């Protein structure tokens, strides 16, 4: 039980055979190469380990998830956004976004940053940037999986920065066929946004269905999503 991955193959074990506690511990080792990383997201697996430990692969149950249209937005956030001081762009500065996420509280090691940077160069990881004038003040990134978006992490340096990043994204996302946003595990910030839990086999089905789905061919080209007043 709990398989040790081999650098030879890009294969993974059945998510269902994952540990129950720690929730979803399914394997360790291997590497963070595009093929394997990418293979993992297809199967609904994801890496998550601290500096010093070997690569830990997970596939929890339940699974945290966020329905784009269920994104809760308080009344004051709407007021704030109606006169937003922020500008939002897509794939303008993936590097800066991930480095910003990798600077808060730490589990985003130099290696993890390098790995997701490659999926960006190959066109699988994307970022949404939140700008306050000429300063990056927030954003988020993830790995697109068809009509499903696997949220990796966000960061904020200015009030409501990350919220406008996600609010705007959801609009753009939904508008073009976006279907769901994977959150992996539920936590305090993610929960206050409308994220919820559903069985691993429920999430896994969506994966198979949505991973085949397709958004506009140019949906991820870098551009501006929202301009301030």
């Amino acid at each position: 039980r709990l398989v040790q991955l081999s650098r030879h193959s890009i294969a993974f074990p059945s998510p269902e055979g994952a540990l129950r506690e720690p929730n979803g511990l399914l394997a360790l080792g291997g590497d963070l190469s595009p093929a394997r990383l990418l293979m993992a997201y297809q199967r609904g697996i994801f890496p998550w380990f601290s500096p010093g430990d070997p690569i830990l692969w997970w596939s929890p149950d339940p699974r945290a998830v966020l329905w784009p249209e269920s994104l809760h937005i308080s009344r004051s956030m709407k007021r704030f956004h109606k006169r937003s001081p922020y500008r939002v762009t897509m794939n303008y500065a993936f590097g800066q976004v991930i480095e910003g996420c990798a600077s808060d509280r730490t589990w985003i090691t130099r290696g993890v940053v390098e790995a997701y940077h490659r999926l960006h160069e190959l066109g699988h990881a994307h970022s949404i940037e939140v700008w306050r004038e000429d300063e990056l003040v927030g954003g988020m990134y993830g790995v697109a999986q068809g009509t499903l978006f696997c949220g990796e992490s966000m960061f904020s340096r200015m009030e409501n920065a990350s919220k406008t990043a996600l609010l705007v994204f959801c609009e753009e996302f939904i508008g073009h066929g976006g279907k769901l946003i994977d959150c992996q595990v539920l936590n305090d910030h993610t929960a206050s946004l409308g994220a919820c839990e559903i069985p691993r086999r429920d999430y896994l089905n969506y994966l198979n269905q949505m991973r085949l789905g397709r958004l506009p061919n140019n949906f991820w080209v870098p551009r501006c999503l929202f301009s301030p007043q």
């Binding site: 994801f46 998550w48 996420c101 589990w107 985003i108 988020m140 993830g142 949220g151 990796e152 992490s153 966000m154 959150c183 992996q184 595990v185 936590n187 305090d188 910030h189 993610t190």
Partner: peptide
């Protein structure tokens, strides 16, 4: 977004 907890 796991990296938030």
């Amino acid at each position: 977004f796991r990296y938030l907890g």
